[PDB]
Amino acid sequence: SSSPRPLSPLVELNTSDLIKQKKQLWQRVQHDGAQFRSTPEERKQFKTALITLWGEQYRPERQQRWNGMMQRMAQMKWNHPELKYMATEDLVALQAWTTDDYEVVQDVLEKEARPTAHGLAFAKCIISALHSLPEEYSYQGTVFTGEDQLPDWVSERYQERSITTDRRFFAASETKNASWQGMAVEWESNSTTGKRISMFSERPNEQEVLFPPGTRFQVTRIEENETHPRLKIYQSQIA
C-alpha cells in the first residue's frame, strides 16, 4: 500500500539485481534488433529516472523540464506527421541524450560498466526511439567522432578486419567541424541506418547521428600516430 499516487506520483525505479537487469537488457537489444520498443511502464520509469537524476531537491525543477520536453515532442509529432507513431517519451529520450544527462547512459550496457537503474531506464527509451524513427531519419554517409579514450580502450573494442558489436550509444556528426581540441581517438564511420537526431537536439546547430548499442561495424583500418589522434578508426556499419 506504500507510495500511493497522491503521496508519491513517480513510480519507483527497479533497483534489484542491476547486473541481471543489464544482462537481460543486452540480450533483448540483440534479440529484438530493430523491433526493440519501450513499453508504457518503461516510459514511466524513464520519466522517474530523468526527474530524479539530480537528487530529491531538483525534482520540482526537473519535473518542469520534463513537462516542457513532453510538450515540445507532442507538438513535434503534430508538426511532423511522419513521427506520429513515435512514443512521446522516446522522443524526449533523444532530447535528453543531447543534454549532460548522456553520461548516465552512454556506457550503461558496456560489459565492464557499473549499471544504474537510471541509466538502464534511459537506455530503453533511447534505443526504442532510434529503432522506431522512420527510415527517412537514417543517414547514409561518413560520420565523424572524436573521444578522449585510451589505447587499450580502443584495442579491447576495435580490431582491424574484425566486426565490432558496439555496446555503447555511439555518437557522431554529419559534419567535420573545426574543433578546439584535437581528440586522442577519431573515427570515420560509414552509416547506413544511423539516425539523424538534430531535429530533437537541444543544440540545433549540431548534426548528430546516434547509433544504439547492438550496432555492428566492420572495422576496415586503424591508423596509429605518435600525436593526436593516437588512433583513427575507419569502420562501416553492417547489417
Author numbering: 58 to 296
Question: What did the original publication write about this model?
Answer:
XopAI resembles a bent right hand, and it can be dissected as a two-lobe structure with an N-terminal α-helical lobe (residues 74 to 193), and a C-terminal β-sandwich lobe (residues 194 to 296). From analyses of the crystal packing, we found that XopAI uses an altered mART domain to bind its own N-terminal peptide containing a conserved Arg residue.
However, the P41212 crystals diffract to a resolution of 1.53 Å and the structure was solved via molecular replacement. Similarly, the first 58 residues of XopAI in the P41212 crystals were not built in the model. For the protein interaction mode found in the P41212 crystals, the central cleft binds residues 59 to 70 from an adjacent protein, and it has an interface area of 673 Å2. In the P41212 crystals, the backbone of the Arg peptide adopts a “W”-shaped conformation in the central cleft. The N-terminus of Arg peptide is placed at the left side of the central cleft, whereas the C-terminus protrudes out of the middle of the cleft. In the P41212 crystals, the residues of the N- and C-termini interact with the PN loop. In the P41212 mode, the backbone oxygen atoms from residues W154 and T156 form three obvious hydrogen bonds with the R62* guanidinium group. The bound R62* in the P41212 mode did not change drastically in conformation through the entire simulation. The loop structure found in the P41212 peptide-bound state is in a stretched conformation, whereas that in the monomer D of the ΔN70 crystal structure is in a contracted conformation. For example, the central cleft in the P41212 peptide-bound state has a volume of 722 Å3; however, that in the monomer D of the ΔN70 crystal structure has a volume of 159 Å3.
